[PDB]
From a paper:
We here-report work carried out on PilO2Bp, a component of the Tfpb R64 thin pilus variant assembly machinery from B. pseudomallei. We show that N-PilO2Bp consists of two α/β sub-domains separated by a prominent central cleft, typical of actin-like ATPases. The function of PilO2 within the Tfpb assembly machinery is not documented, however, PilO2 is reported to be an assembly protein that localizes in the cytoplasm in the absence of other Pil proteins, translocating to the OM in their presence. FFPred, from the PSIPRED website, predicted the most plausible topology, with a cytoplasmic localization for the N-terminal domain (1-194), a transmembrane domain (195-214), and a periplasmic localization for the C-terminal domain (215-432).
Although the crystal structure of N-PilO2Bp displays one protein chain per asymmetric unit, inspection of crystal packing highlights three differently packed ‘dimers’. The second crystal packing dimer is built around an ‘anchor loop’ that covers residues 168-179. This loop was refined with higher than average B-factors, suggesting conformational flexibility that may mediate PilO2Bp interaction/recognition with other assembly machinery partners. Due to even higher flexibility, in the absence of phosphate it was not possible to model the anchor loop structure into continuous electron density. The conformational flexibility of the loop thus appears to be dependent on intermolecular interactions. On the other hand, the stabilization of the (otherwise flexible) ‘anchor loop’ built by residues 169-179 is obtained thanks to intermolecular interactions that occur in a region characterized by positively charged residues, suggesting its potential role in the assembly with other (macro)molecular partners.
Numbering used by the authors: 4 to 169, 178 to 187
The structure:
């Protein structure tokens, strides 16, 4: 299900795979898509990360769909986060955001990379359940998300709406 944000079509629900950094990154990503059985990919390569985000046409994904996760994770990697009265990098963060159409997005990032299923879209209800479940593992710098999550009483929380974080060519899904 595309997520329409302004006149752009975004997607959640990619499967995130960290890459070895040892071989040609693109060729490694392709070979892993073949083993994991995915026909679409995005490639996230910056100083903080070498990772591929995968999807299948059969699940309703298509070339040209933009990765919402890629966009959000980039934006936090650049800005960092505000908590404890300080501006600091947030390599380990989790969050949930209202999308314009009423669905919610859930994100779980460690060392500036997505956890394998840390990019999810569905109901508010289930986004919160996913957030708490991952939260229990610990090692999280901050929860970043919809201002109403303050009432969850996480130790470190930064209110943030998706609008505040909003593209780059690399976000678009392409054939493997
Ligand atoms: K991985
Ligand atoms: K993975
Ligand atoms: K995504
Ligand atoms: K995995
Ligand atoms: K997995
Ligand atoms: K996960
Ligand atoms: K952990």
């Amino acid at each position: 299900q595309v997520i329409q944000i302004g006149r752009q079509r975004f997607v959640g629900g990619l499967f995130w795979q960290s890459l070895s950094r040892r071989n040609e990154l693109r060729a490694e990503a392709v070979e892993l898509a073949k083993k994991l059985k995915f026909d679409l990919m995005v490639l996230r390569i910056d100083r903080g990360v070498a990772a591929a985000g995968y999807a299948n046409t059969r699940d309703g994904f298509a070339p040209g769909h933009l990765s919402l996760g890629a966009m959000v994770s980039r934006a936090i990697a650049l800005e960092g986060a505000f908590y404890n009265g300080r501006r600091q990098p947030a390599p380990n963060w989790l969050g949930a955001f209202a999308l314009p159409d009423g669905r919610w997005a859930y994100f779980a990032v460690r060392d500036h990379a997505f956890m394998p299923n840390g990019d999810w879209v569905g109901s508010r209800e289930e986004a919160l359940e996913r957030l708490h479940t991952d939260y229990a593992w610990g090692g999280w710098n901050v929860v970043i998300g919809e201002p109403e999550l303050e009432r969850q009483g996480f130790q470190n929380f930064q209110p943030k709406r998706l609008d505040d974080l909003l593209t780059e060519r690399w976000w678009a899904l392409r054939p493997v």
